[PDB]
Amino acid sequence: GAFGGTLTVKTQPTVTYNAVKDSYQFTVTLTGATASVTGFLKAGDQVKFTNTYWLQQQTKQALYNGATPISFTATVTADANSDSGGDVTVTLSGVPIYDTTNPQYNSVSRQVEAGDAVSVVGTA
């Protein structure tokens, strides 16, 4: 069954990435549907986002690869707007786990890219 949540990634999810302080968040302007939906979801509601980074080939200078990260459940941290323009901006807690786990410090981490899809795994 469907919850009625199917959104899009309009911008690039990136915010404070700190490990020793256990601080991982990302802010995004997401895209959604028309008005009459006052807040898709809010603080504490979980989503399921799939922002697939294909920025692998150029960053590794090789290894064309055939598997994109494929992200999963995240969490919305405030009022997420469904307006007439279908723009839903809200910041999330968490990160692309198992993929962006490499700060590297010398090897510049792969950059985030927009154009992916979003869904909702939260309940109430």
Q: What is the DSSP string of 58-119?
A: HHHTS---S------EEEE-S---B-TT-EEEEEEES--TTTS----SSSPPPPP----EEE
AA letter at 124: A
Q: Which domain holds residue 31?
A: 1-124
Question: Could you give the number of structural domains in the chain?
Answer: 1
In 3D space, the residue among 32, 28, 30 whose CA is nearest the CA of residue 4 turns out to be 32
Residue 48, both tokens:
């399921």
Say how many Å lie between the first and final Cα of the chain, rounded: 16
- Virtual torsion, Cα 64, 25, 13, 46, nearest 10 deg: 100
Tell me the backbone φ, ψ of residue 18, rounded to 5 degrees.
-135, 130
Method by which this entry was solved: NMR
User: What is the CA angle 118-119-123, rounded to 5?
Assistant: 150
Beta bridge partners of 32: none
In 3D space, the residue among 78, 100, 101 whose CA is nearest the CA of residue 30 turns out to be 78
User: CA-to-CA distance for 111 and 2, rounded, in angstroms?
Assistant: 32
Residues in the chain: 124
AA letter at 35: A
DSSP-derived 3-state class of residue 57: helix
AA letter at 102: N
